[PDB]
Amino acid sequence: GLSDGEWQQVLNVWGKVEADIAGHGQEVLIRLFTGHPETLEKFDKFKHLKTEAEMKASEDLKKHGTVVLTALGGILKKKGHHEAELKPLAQSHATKHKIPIKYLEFISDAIIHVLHSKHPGDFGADAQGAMTKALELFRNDIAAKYKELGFQ
Ligand code: HEM
Structure with a gap:
């Protein structure tokens, strides 16, 4: 549950992502896959990627990054x-993709990391607090459907 002030911050931060949704989405997924390699195993079409360079060079990864953040932004x-x-x-990730909620925690923190990395000094304490709460809400509502x- 967020206040309007907090939602304001969330959507303010999101404007950053929307200026370059493919670049953000790419870096989020890369942060996830390199931070938590077991996540890579859930993607049949990315499991071939061994190295981060291959990840960086993958237009299909950028494409999926766009799909993911487009979906997340619609939700936010x-x-x-x-x-x-x-x-x-929630249904597709529990029943088709079989993604444990732990991996949603992973990508939540990864989004936070990427925003600091791409906007150092431009992602304030209040902004992080709001974004973190928004992602927790998202996660919590997915967890309810799980x-x-x-589904475990
Ligand atoms: C903010 C979090 C996430 C969002 C908004 C999101 C959104 C989406 C969307 C829109 C699709 C395509 C349609 C569908 O299959 O439902 C998708 C597919 C998929 N997602 Fe997620 N996702 C998220 C997190 C994750 C995580 C953390 C994982 C695994 C670690 C994951 C694994 C997958 C896989 C394996 C597919 C199918 C890929 C393919 O073969 O095309 N997702 N996701």
Whole structure:
């Protein structure tokens, strides 16, 4: 649960991402895959990537980065009223992709890392607090659907 001031910060920060959604999305996924290599195993179409250079050079990875952040941004722009948007993602990730909620924690922190990396000194304490809360909300609502489905 976020305040309007906090949502304001979230969507302010998101404007940064939208100026270069492919660049951000790429770096988020790279941070995830290199930080937590077991995550790479969940992607049949990325499991071939051994090195970060190959990751950096992958246009399909950038493409998927765009799809992921486009989806996330759509959800964030709802300011918490995202049930319709989130349910199919929760379902596909639990039932088709089999993604444990732990990996959603991983990518949440990765987004935080990337924002600091791409905007050093431009991602303030208040901004981090708001973004972190937004991602926690996202995660928590997914976790509820996972419980429903009995998915671990
Ligand atoms: C902010 C978090 C995330 C968002 C918004 C997101 C969104 C999406 C979307 C929109 C798709 C394509 C449609 C679909 O299959 O539902 C997708 C596919 C997929 N996602 Fe996620 N995702 C997130 C996190 C993750 C994480 C953390 C993992 C694994 C570590 C993951 C694994 C996958 C896989 C394996 C696919 C299918 C890829 C393919 O073969 O095309 N996702 N995701």
